[PDB]
Design a protein around this ligand. Structure first.
Ligand SMILES: CCCCCCCCCCCCCCCC
Ligand SMILES: *[C@@H]1O[C@H](CO)[C@@H](O)[C@H](O)[C@H]1NC(C)=O
Ligand SMILES: *[C@@H]1O[C@H](CO)[C@@H](O)[C@H](O)[C@H]1NC(C)=O
Ligand SMILES: *[C@@H]1O[C@H](CO)[C@@H](O)[C@H](O)[C@H]1NC(C)=O
Ligand SMILES: CCCCCCCCCC
Ligand SMILES: CCCCCC
Length: 167
């Protein structure tokens, strides 16, 4: 009983991005993300959520993408960051038949970059390369409740409750 979410972001430059993503519930594809930042398709393949509730979830995902893009632009603006690049975000929750296991792992240009430590709602480097980019990204992720305790709540409560409601 799990929900997994995958987001791949292709940045031609800091300001133009193409998204490709999907989610699966119990190992079955349930959602698809596709399109440029200006017009991104976000679809549930199965009518799991009622329309008013889905429109709420769709809106939240759109706002996430805008904040994600904002952070990538800020890293570019403050550190040396070379484009084009790809970012992979892999996150979700898994319910043992006890405590849920949740995760959020980020790769850049196919290499491990940062990941979320839910035990303390903190981000760590997954690379051994000491890097102004990695250091600056961590400083931003670890400075805001949105990417700390609020993200832990999304993974530990929202995603788990989605699995509990729909598997
Ligand atoms: C240069 C690589 C960037 C890696 C970005 C990781 C994104 C993790 C979630 C970010 C979206 C939440 C809002 C961020 C607000 C600062
Ligand atoms: C997303 O789709 C890709 C394409 O096959 C697949 O490899 C991956 O497992 C999927 N992930 C999720 C969370 O649905
Ligand atoms: C946005 O994308 C959808 C799906 O590709 C398309 O139907 C719609 O016309 C697009 N809107 C534009 C290009 O303004
Ligand atoms: C990512 O890879 C592309 C080509 O593979 C390169 O042009 C770009 O500079 C790379 N960016 C980073 C941050 O490694
Ligand atoms: C359709 C799946 C899109 C990728 C997952 C986005 C998760 C954002 C969590 C805040
Ligand atoms: C793609 C989002 C699925 C639902 C997350 C609670």
């Amino acid at each position: 009983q799990r929900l997994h979410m995958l987001q791949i972001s292709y940045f031609r430059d800091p300001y133009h991005v193409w998204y490709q993503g999907n989610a699966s519930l119990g190992g079955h594809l349930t959602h698809v993300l596709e399109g440029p930042d200006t017009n991104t398709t976000i679809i549930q393949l199965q009518p799991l959520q009622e329309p008013e509730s889905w429109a709420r979830t769709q809106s939240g995902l759109q706002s996430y993408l805008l904040q994600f893009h904002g952070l990538v632009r800020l890293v570019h603006q403050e550190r040396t960051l070379a484009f084009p690049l790809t970012i992979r975000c892999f996150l979700g929750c898994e319910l043992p038949p006890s405590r849920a296991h949740v995760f959020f792992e980020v790769a850049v240009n196919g290499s491990s970059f940062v990941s979320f430590r839910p035990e303390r709602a903190l981000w760590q480097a997954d690379t051994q390369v000491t890097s102004g980019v990695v250091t600056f990204t961590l400083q931003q992720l670890n400075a805001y409740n949105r990417t700390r305790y609020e993200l832990r709540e999304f993974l530990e409560d929202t995603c788990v409750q989605y699995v509990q409601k729909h598997i």
